[PDB]
Amino acid sequence: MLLPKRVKYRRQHRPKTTGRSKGGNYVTFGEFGLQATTTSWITSRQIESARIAMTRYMKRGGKVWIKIFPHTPYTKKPLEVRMGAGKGAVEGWIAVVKPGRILFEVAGVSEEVAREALRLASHKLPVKTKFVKREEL
Amino acid sequence: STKNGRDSESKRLGAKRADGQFVTGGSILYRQRGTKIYPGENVGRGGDDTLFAKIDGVVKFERKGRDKKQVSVYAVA
């Protein structure tokens, strides 16, 4: 359900997946976070599912930040029809993440609770993940 | 259907002579829209914003200030 209020161009090139994370690789707002380890697209429904599963386990407790927004639309032809009569209609919205990228941050809750909630979130996602804390030293 | 199948004929813009070569007294040096490159010594500026040499010599691209560039021609021979 997350998406932008408006975009200049509705149809865009599909992004690139090679490389490492340009930014967003450190927890800044909270105490604990879920870092990505592989590359993929996240489709704006996966985020919702993970946020719900991570919220209800904390039971209106701490605080959760989503460090990711799907800015990029992707198209789809509805029925498998002939190739090439123009580009299709928008179907959803995606964000691209590369290894190093932080996806979710949490604070105001214990470490074990954070671990379990982020595990439940990770099982709703198409990418391998890893629990991490604030950097020191 | 679609409604995006249009484009214009590409115009052959850009540099036509290089820094350091000899040229004659009416040769074109740089075709562009507006002034990416300004004219300098013995260099003109046409109605199409085209840059041309007034005299025969070697062509030198050089800066103008902090963020601008020009061409010049010098008659050493």
């Binding site: 490492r20 690789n25 870092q35 190093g100 030293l137 | -």
Partner: protein, 94 residues
């Protein structure tokens, strides 16, 4: 607060740098007033222990060849994906 350092010779290539990082070492620089700029290597574990005992913003009297220099940490390049340090800049406060 008594670290050691070995001076890197000239023209370290990618391969030797990553061999040095496969080993427990890490590249570093020392600059500031009192000395010229020198490129060295340091043991990651010993550097971590010194930081644990002294603090992030603390002084270290580390040894460079013949002499010793009081020095503070300016910046450090860190690899969050495998949680190891990959470069460290030292600033001579004197």
């Amino acid at each position: 607060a008594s670290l050691k350092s070995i001076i890197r010779q000239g023209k370290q290539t990618r391969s030797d740098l990553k061999q040095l990082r496969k080993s427990g070492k890490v590249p570093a620089v020392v600059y500031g007033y009192g000395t010229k700029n020198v490129s060295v290597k340091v043991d990651e574990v010993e550097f971590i222990k010194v930081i644990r005992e002294v603090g992030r913003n603390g002084v270290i009297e580390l040894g460079v060849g013949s002499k010793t220099i009081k020095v503070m940490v300016a910046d450090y390049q860190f690899d969050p994906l495998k949680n190891q340090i990959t470069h460290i800049d030292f600033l001579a406060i004197n």
